[PDB]
């Protein structure tokens, strides 16, 4: 659970020469949302854990609350997850996919000759 | 192992900077017709104790034993191709191995014979 202060980000007034368009302060905000900011802060406290997602929880006068889902990619029960292997990496040898696909095509052609070839020729 | 590039700068770079095992191939000399028939190989790198015939230069026609070989310089010292310095000592002329013909072979080294079979075959 992450708590942070709402509002626009702390835009700094420039201390040097600027053209008048570039001197404003009030109303200027960051292109990042507080949800992504809350994700990054949670990522710092749990170093090495990957961020999955986060959602809004509550608002008050000063603060906004988010819940960030982080996962340990080094844990055995996380690596084999069908969803969590998208973040923790996944590899299949080409021999595994190529051999079975070849074997499927050999058997499909055998079946189609006896069942589809007479209809096609006719 | 000697550049295959046709650029002269790359050819000269590999020759000068060649390691010791590659400079041995620059010591190759032509065998005499008798030794060619006696061995069946057309070349052998010159070895200390081989008898050679100088074939170019001032000492062309001199035959002698190889007293010293230098891998770094790729030069060989032969008896007869000598001279005396100002102080009187006798010194050797460095002969490139490609200017001599091996008229006798030093085959006491067992490793040399195995190289003989490789080139006749």
């Amino acid at each position: 659970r992450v708590r942070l202060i709402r509002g626009p980000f702390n835009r700094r007034r420039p201390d040097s020469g600027r053209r008048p368009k570039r001197m404003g302060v009030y109303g200027i905000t960051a292109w990042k949302s507080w949800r992504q900011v809350a994700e990054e802060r949670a990522a710092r406290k749990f170093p090495g854990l990957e961020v999955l997602n986060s959602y809004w929880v509550a608002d008050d006068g000063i603060y906004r609350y988010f819940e960030v889902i982080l996962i340990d990619c080094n844990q055995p029960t996380i690596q084999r997850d069908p969803l969590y292997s998208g973040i923790c990496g996944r590899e299949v040898p080409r021999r595994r996919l190529a051999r079975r696909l070849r074997e499927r095509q050999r058997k499909l052609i055998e079946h189609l000759k006896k069942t589809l070839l007479p209809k096609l020729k006719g | 192992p000697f550049t295959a590039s046709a650029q002269p700068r790359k050819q000269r770079l590999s020759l000068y900077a060649a390691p010791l095992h590659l400079r041995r191939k620059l010591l190759n000399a032509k065998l005499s017709p008798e030794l060619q028939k006696k061995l069946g190989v057309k070349r052998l790198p010159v070895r200390r104790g081989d008898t050679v015939l100088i074939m170019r230069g001032d000492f062309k026609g001199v035959t002698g034993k190889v007293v010293k070989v230098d891998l770094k310089r790729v030069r060989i010292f032969v008896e007869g191709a000598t001279r005396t310095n100002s102080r009187g000592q006798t010194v050797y002329y460095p002969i490139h191995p490609s200017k001599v013909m091996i008229v006798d072979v030093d085959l006491s080294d067992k490793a040399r014979q195995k190289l003989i079979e490789r080139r006749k075959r």
């Binding site: - | 046709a6 650029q7 002269p8 700068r9």
Partner: protein, 213 residues
């Protein structure tokens, strides 16, 4: 494409120190080498003012129909003894032009066998011309891989790729051997001047009727 380093002569810390020092107002070194000039084309170590640019267009484009018309024109120049003698070739022993040989010549696989056919057809004197005409060229080309300048002797046109006659004649000094479908201006007019001593095979002449037109 040739060029210089993009930052050559421009990466020194230099600046112009204005007037009043009694020295010219070109940029100079900022540090311990202060009076030393820098960055300008007229200074030692300065940038080249207008160097060669790698994006320069060196290729001279030619229309396809125009380029094929020239190839037919250069082909016709090989039919005349005047042009081939003008380009430099020796054709005194050549029985006639354009010189066409039978298609059995494509089976010659050895250089020694091919050398007979050149001698029997009066072509060997021009190949012999290129052999003794090889010269160590003057200038910096020796440093850059262009030590030798070798004349052109005879272009051999075979019917198709990978005939054995290509590997049997390609070692002769000045001799080019191409299939008729691979004809181009670099073999038909060396130096930009028409008229090349060409040995056509009979089958290549038959295949010429549907190319470059």
């Amino acid at each position: 494409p040739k060029g210089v380093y993009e930052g050559a002569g421009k990466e020194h810390s230099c600046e112009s120190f204005g007037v009043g020092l009694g020295i010219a107002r070109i940029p100079r070194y900022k540090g311990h080498l202060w009076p030393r000039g820098c960055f300008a084309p007229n200074t030692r170590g300065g940038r080249r003012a207008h160097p060669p640019r790698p994006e320069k267009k060196l290729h001279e484009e030619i229309n396809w129909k125009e380029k094929n018309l020239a190839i037919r024109s250069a082909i016709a120049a090989t039919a005349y003894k005047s042009w081939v003698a003008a380009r430099g070739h020796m054709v005194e022993k050549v029985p006639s032009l354009p010189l066409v040989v039978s298609g059995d010549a494509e089976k010659i696989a050895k250089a020694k066998e091919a050398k007979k056919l050149f001698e029997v057809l009066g072509l060997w004197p021009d190949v012999e011309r290129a052999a003794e005409g090889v010269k160590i060229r003057a200038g910096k080309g020796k440093m850059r891989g262009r030590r030798y300048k070798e004349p052109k002797s005879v272009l051999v046109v075979v019917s198709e790729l990978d005939v054995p006659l290509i590997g049997a004649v390609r070692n002769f000094p000045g001799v080019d051997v191409v299939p008729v479908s691979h004809l181009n201006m670099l073999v038909l007019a060396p130096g930009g001047v028409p008229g090349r001593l060409t040995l056509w095979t009979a089958t290549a002449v038959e295949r010429l009727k549907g190319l470059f037109l």
